[PDB]
Amino acid sequence: EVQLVESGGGLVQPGGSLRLSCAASGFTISSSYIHWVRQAPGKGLEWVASISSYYGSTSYADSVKGRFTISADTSKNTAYLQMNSLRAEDTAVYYCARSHYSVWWGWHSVSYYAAFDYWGQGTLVTVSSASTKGPSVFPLAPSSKSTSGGTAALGCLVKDYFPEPVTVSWNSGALTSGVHTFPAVLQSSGLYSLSSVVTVPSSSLGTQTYICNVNHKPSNTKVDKKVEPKSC
Amino acid sequence: IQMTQSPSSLSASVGDRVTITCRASQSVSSAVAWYQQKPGKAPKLLIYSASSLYSGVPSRFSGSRSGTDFTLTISSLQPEDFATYYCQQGSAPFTFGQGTKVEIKRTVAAPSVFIFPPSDEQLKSGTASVVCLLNNFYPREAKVSWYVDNALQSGNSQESVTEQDSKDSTYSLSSTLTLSKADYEKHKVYACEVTQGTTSVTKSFNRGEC
Ligand SMILES: [Cl-]
Ligand SMILES: [Cl-]
Ligand SMILES: [Cl-]
Ligand SMILES: [Cl-]
Ligand SMILES: [Cl-]
Ligand code: NA
């Protein structure tokens, strides 16, 4: 029943500002310390900030002091992390988390140890001056003449988009067996590209319909593409 | 007050005993936590207070302390256990360890290999993307070579590898070769060669085909 849902990530020009939200459900935020923890792409975990609305106490990773402001609204059972003067070093997936040790005693001079038991889903904060570009989506058509493992393969190539992320889905979520969506790769152009593939019975090539559904929430664009054998 | 984690990466087989160690620079009481992170997902708490198993966490996980050294132990590795594991100290400033990538070791697995010509829609753009798919193989390292009219291609392809499958511990890999529409249109035979051990497979197509 306990859930932590984030919001407010996305692209931001260097030096600009973003506000991240953390909506808690299934527990009161005053009974807890709420923390933010970020992860730069490919690097490890770094604690950023913490708040307890009950004590009115906030604490900041030195790496952000003064530029970040972490706050909470009890009426809304929600925590916020407002970020000002963002730098490239600030690009990361930001997570909110609840410390497992509740503010149990109502006495004030009590330091609590931190272990994070409930986490948000993570939102990406990207600090670049590049423009948002939506993806082009191209079929990866099978051949009945190129069968590998008794089965056939088909795909969607999702090319030249920024920023990440892109969600791919097949036949409106009705096909999940055999699907591999690849991690995105960053082209020399500075644009991203990935592809998503699915293995299917060799017989079903002409008989079945395969539509890939590509979602690029950063550009508010969703593309559906039917995949067919070339058939000239 | 820093947290040195060790080793940085390890491979071990299903059921092997895995031990990750964390080194605190000063004394952090017993307030140390352990997390399992699957790629791009939020970390999951495993151990808090250095020794206490978080509810829901399988019994195969345990934590222990010996002085300034906290260790996480997986008594018999499971294929769904590939992840990156982090130690964290529980007192301020809550430093995290460096991470320990746990990759799983299994039998050699042959890739199923497919090749895909570029689409006509992409051709109206002036660029051709040829994609070579290696499906459900192990180990991760495989030699993929591109040929265009039997000329080896270099410098114009990009690889992407999936994460390990959570039941069979295999990978899948994509190779994307990018060319000008003019370049693609002046050559006939496209081929992707996969080498693994003492077996090479080459998959191909001719531009004029159906
Ligand atoms: Cl508690
Ligand atoms: Cl498109
Ligand atoms: Cl090893
Ligand atoms: Cl940290
Ligand atoms: Cl052909
Ligand atoms: Na992406």
Residue numbers in the entry:
A (entry chain D): 1 to 9, 11 to 35, 40 to 64, 67 to 72, 74 to 240
B (entry chain E): 2 to 32, 39 to 58, 66 to 72, 74 to 80, 83 to 111, 115 to 220, 223 to 232
Paper text:
The receptor tyrosine kinase EphA2 interacts with ephrin (Efn) ligands to mediate bi‐directional signals that drive cellular sorting processes during tissue development. Efn ligands bind to the LBD and sterically seed clusters of Eph ECDs, which then drive forward signaling through tyrosine autophosphorylation of the Eph intracellular domains (ICDs). To elucidate the details of the mechanisms of Eph receptor clustering and activation, we developed a panel of synthetic Abs targeting the ECD subdomains of EphA2, and produced monovalent Fabs and bivalent IgGs to either negatively or positively modulate signaling.
To facilitate crystallization, we took advantage of optimized Fab frameworks that enhance the quantity and quality of Fab‐antigen crystals (Bruce et al., 2023, 2024).
